[PDB]
Write an enzyme that holds these catalytic residues in place. Sequence first.
Site, PDB file in Angstrom:
ATOM      1  CD  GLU A 764     -46.645  26.402 -53.901  1.00 44.11           C
ATOM      2  OE1 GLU A 764     -47.093  26.054 -52.790  1.00 44.11           O
ATOM      3  OE2 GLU A 764     -45.497  26.105 -54.294  1.00 44.11           O
ATOM      4  CG  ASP A 765     -52.430  25.220 -51.190  1.00 44.68           C
ATOM      5  OD1 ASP A 765     -51.683  24.293 -51.563  1.00 44.68           O
ATOM      6  OD2 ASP A 765     -52.543  25.567 -49.995  1.00 44.68           O
ATOM      7  CB  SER A 766     -54.026  28.182 -57.538  1.00 42.42           C
ATOM      8  OG  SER A 766     -53.932  29.445 -56.917  1.00 42.42           O
TER       9      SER A 766
END
Lengths: 1134, 67, 48, 114, 96
Positions: A764-766
């Site tokens: 995801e965006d991590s």
Amino acid sequence: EITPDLWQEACWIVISSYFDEKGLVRQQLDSFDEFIQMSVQRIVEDAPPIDLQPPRYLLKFEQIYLSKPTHWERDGAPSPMMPNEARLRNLTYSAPLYVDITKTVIKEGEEQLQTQHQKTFIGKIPIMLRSTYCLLNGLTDRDLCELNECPLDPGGYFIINGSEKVLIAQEKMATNTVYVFAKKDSKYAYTGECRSCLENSSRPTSTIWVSMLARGGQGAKKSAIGQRIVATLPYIKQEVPIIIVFRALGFVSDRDILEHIIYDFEDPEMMEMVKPSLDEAFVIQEQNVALNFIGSRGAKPGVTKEKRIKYAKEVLQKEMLPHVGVSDFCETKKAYFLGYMVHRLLLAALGRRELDDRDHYGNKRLDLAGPLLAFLFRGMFKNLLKEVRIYAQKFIDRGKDFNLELAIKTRIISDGLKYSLATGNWGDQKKAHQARAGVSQVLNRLTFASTLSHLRRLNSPIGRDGKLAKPRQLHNTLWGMVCPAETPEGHAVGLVKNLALMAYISVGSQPSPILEFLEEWSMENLEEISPAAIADATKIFVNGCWVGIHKDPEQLMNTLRKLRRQMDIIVSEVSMIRDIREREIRIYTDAGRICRPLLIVEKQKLLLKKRHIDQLKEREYNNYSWQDLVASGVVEYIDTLEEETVMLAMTPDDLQEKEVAYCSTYTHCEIHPSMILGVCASIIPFPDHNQSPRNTYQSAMGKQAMGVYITNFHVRMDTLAHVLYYPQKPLVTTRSMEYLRFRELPAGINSIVAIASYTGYNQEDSVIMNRSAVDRGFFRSVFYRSYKEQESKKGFDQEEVFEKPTRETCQGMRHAIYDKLDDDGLIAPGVRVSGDDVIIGKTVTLPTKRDCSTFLRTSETGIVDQVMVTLNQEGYKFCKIRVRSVRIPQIGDKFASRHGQKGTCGIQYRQEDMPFTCEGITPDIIINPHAIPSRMTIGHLIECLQGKVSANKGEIGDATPFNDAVNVQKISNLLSDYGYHLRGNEVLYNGFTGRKITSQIFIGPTYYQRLKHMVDDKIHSRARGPIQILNRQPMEGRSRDGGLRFGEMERDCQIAHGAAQFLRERLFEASDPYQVHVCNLCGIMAIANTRTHTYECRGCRNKTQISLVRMPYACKLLFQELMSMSIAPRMMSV
Amino acid sequence: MIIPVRCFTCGKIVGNKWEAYLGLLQAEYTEGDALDALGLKRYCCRRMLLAHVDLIEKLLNYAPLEK
Amino acid sequence: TVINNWLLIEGHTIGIGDSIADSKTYQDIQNTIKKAKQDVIEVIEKAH
Amino acid sequence: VGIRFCQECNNMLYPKEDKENRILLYACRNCDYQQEADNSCIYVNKITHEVDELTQIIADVSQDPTLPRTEDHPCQKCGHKEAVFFQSHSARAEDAMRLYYVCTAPHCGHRWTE
Amino acid sequence: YARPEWMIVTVLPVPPLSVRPAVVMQGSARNQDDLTHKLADIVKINNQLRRNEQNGAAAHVIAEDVKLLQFHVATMVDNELPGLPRAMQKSGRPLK
DNA sequence: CAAGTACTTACGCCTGGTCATT
RNA sequence: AAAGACCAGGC
Ligand SMILES: [Zn+2]
Ligand SMILES: [Zn+2]
Ligand SMILES: [Zn+2]
Ligand SMILES: [Zn+2]
């Protein structure tokens, strides 16, 4: 003698000259300085004299005197007030205002006595920081550092009660102009409105409407395509036909009225359009009867004809169109302007004119601190005069004497200004609800870029709840005036905007010289011209008022431009527009216009020759500045509505030169198209490659980045102060960053970013942050939090005091540890204060004592930095304690690139676990390759490439948006020249197994910034904590140990699950559980003494038939609240 | 603020190479040549000296709390 | 679990090399854009 | 077609019939002025509004920098090559895309459509 | 369950202390809820009206007392009322 | 029985600071 | 310390 292929340095030389002279917060300072030097004096003098009656008293205020800020202590001794003392002591950085008063008393003895009350103090105006009146003005950096002020600190904020307040520019429709709109479905088809203000001298605005009454007729008069022009005047309950209004001004004949409306009778279409309006007013044929017709429709009709006529004349002269004139004989000028409005309306009706664009930015004026503080000061001075007149009148019935010093209440001005700047509600305290809010916010000091963005901000006053998309869209006219990117997400998108780098807001100039020059240099005034000569002549408007007509317009525009360029009669901020197709010329000296400096193009070449750049390169020891460049006729300010009549060349080297010609009549040229972007969007490297929403996300995120927000954070005791440990200036920089001072106060650090999918903890965006880097000081920050406590004396014997509570002296106590407090009740710095520990020992003597000491926030575990004692405004003891907590980046924290690539630290692998190159460069941050492709952020990739090439080469790369000499292939070749892959890839080895990763990872040094959002400031847990006093449900919030909310959508979801018991537990047992006793005969709850077991229901004398009902306390309150509304919610259990 | 000792990405001491970097830049050299003359071969180390901002000089301009 | 632990061996990335095409394709794209511009110029002239 | 004003009070003249003479007379209503008429057309309702735009155009638009100019189309009167061209810029433009040219050089002011 | 004559407010139900909290100010004072203040106004105007009716009044002072009392009852029940002044606290703030 | 008016409603949750009144 | 308003912000 020109600048070809050397242009890149020349444009940035002139831009640097601009920002060296003007600065980043110039609009605030200039607006406030004009307010103090001109607006305050003008407002006080223009206020009507106080006339009292029998002897007669006259009071006149002559001249103002605004001293420098001073602090009157308890003893009353004056003392200079440094701004840092204002911040620390919760003072107000304000400067007293003195006014000379003359009091003439006439005793009917033929000799009136004049007494002068000199330098009368009437209030204290807050002084904007680094204004011409601040004690910080003109001081060198060494002097400011001796005063513990940061030389980089922009200024432009007031200090009210210790806090820093920034006045946001508020938009408003441009007054003294005619705008022809078209409502969607109204009873009016086309409506021309004019908002009229008398040079901002008095009254907010008294608008006038002139509408056309749709197509549906009034029974037996309209039988055409839509006619019967009508006029909506101020202070008239209903509409008035326009011809009646015209006749009310003394123009009886329909030929004269038409001559004022239609300028050339040889156009039969307009006559056919205006004829039914005449037919409506055929009945009224005299001046007095027309005035009566207007008056009888006013707020309250007069009993007699004379009163109605007088009221109608007063409405026509004073309030209806006051900008054209308010002095008696001005009726002819009003007739001409009203005819102009009707003519615009008829043009729109025939279709020869475009309906004025709603959000067109030439139709908007920005009220900076100047006009806003003027708007409040006019009201407060009116109030001071009203109170002094009241005092004098109540003291003159006795007939003894009268004193001005006693009569003047300084609190009016002082407290009104203070309240309006502090609370934000613009107006009187009593009218808070009707007042504008959101102006005068608190200057956010998280990051330097945030301070700058707050000092340069515009706020559209329209309600944020509007669903119409048009007022939020980016208008074309914002080019170079407002950042196309910077706008807050959410329901305030497009309505809170930020200035472009070059934007300047006009401060104001009295239009006396322009009128004088026009009168001397030909021009024919509206009084001394035959109406038939107006068809072929241009119409010169000055500040919107129609000053006359001119026969040779092109010569006038050439001469006016020459004057403005040489800055003799016309100041540089005055705009001059020649609407050629509409034979109009508008000259604006109004304050609030938004302009940008554009280079002048004559023939097909710049007036900016090599000599100017040569003198600017020697800017030092040559006294050549931006003002010399402007005064030499090279650069010119262009506002939004003169930008229409300007053909602009984006860059010289590509557009001026002869080619397959596109435009051979360029009138101005842009210094560099990177000045369209605002302060927070100029930090984006290669922003032209990103998707625009990512630029907006970065603009929002940069204000939340972390760094050294001001170099004197050691002295300022401010709440929520994040200071980063090791800021780094970007290796892929934009030239604009040199003027934002971003290099001097960086917010972020360059991280060897790998775009790889390593272990799935970056999905995801991590992001995956290197534990070893964070170990060695990566992204480490300090979180200073300030606690303020104030000793006070409220009751007679009720006294607060700073002293360490003993075990048994104070009735109220908490399980905290009080051992850290000294004798004074204050912890000395260096003491390691954990959560719940006492900071400032304090107790109140109850009428033995009740503790009111200040604990810490939960789960902080900090160390005290600095503890300060002073006296507040009232002279009591005042303490401010700062606790610092070193916040090492953990795996809940938020990190963002300069391209909208945001993410939480998924996991913190150690260096051995991190993948490594053949050299040993293990990425500090690994970001997900999946983040990029959908959102098409390419400034991130090119910035990694440029960071690699710059770190290898040794310079700091250039990421200026539109450079055309920094291509991807050029950077790639420069990178291949250093022994790396041209695309930035590197063969990476798995740290776990040692094997090469079969896919080559894109590694490069990218500027990543830490954000204020840390997980330790977001994690909350609740298990049977406090309850509200009213609802008896868990409190609201993380600080109040509150509980998460089980809103309606959650219960709908649970019902969908078919989960009755969990729903009941969440909405009954988890929250307020309660038991009530309900009578069976009547559902009204019964008195229940449980210990005595005497359950009695008054109202039926019942004592046995009672049942116990378990209902939420919220439902009990609902039932009782209904009972207080006479509703009886009977709970019958049978 | 002050020169970060122990370059983050790898670990080499770049905390004693700032005053030498300033002297070298002030005297003759380009930034790349000064970084080479300090033996910072790896570009991660070069990002420390090259991109640092020596705010401690700005901090030291302020008078101390106590004399 | 299994696919991530194989991806440890294989690996995945994104970078400039994936956003650059061969010079031939740049030429074809520029020619198509210019042909479209010439078509729209022709249509503007036809409407005028 | 247009409006004819009275000669005494300058108020509007409304159409009327002279019964004894059987002729169209513009009669005044603010006074007793009566005038013989020559147009014999009280009202005209051009709903199709097939209006030529050349009458509206003003020659001063020739000295507008922002407008485009062609040397390909010369003026019919003076033969001057340069000509500033622009679209209707007004109503009825939603179904009309014809260009209008105004010749340059001072004192010509010629305008035509192609 | 509901007669029409019951709809005219002849006895006003004073809500208990729970509905209108009295928050203790540091053991020294007691700040009252908005309904408590409106009830204080209702009691004042009702007592004034009862006293005036006892005295004799002037048949227009009774009119203004009745108007004020009716306003206070309605604004305790509903403050959003159009065409009527919104109830305010000691400062300028509409009542809940 | 139409033409007029007024009333009610307009995502969910969460974080912090500030201020006036008590 | 309390609930009321406002502001800024996160998803
Ligand atoms: Zn009962
Ligand atoms: Zn290193
Ligand atoms: Zn007549
Ligand atoms: Zn010609």
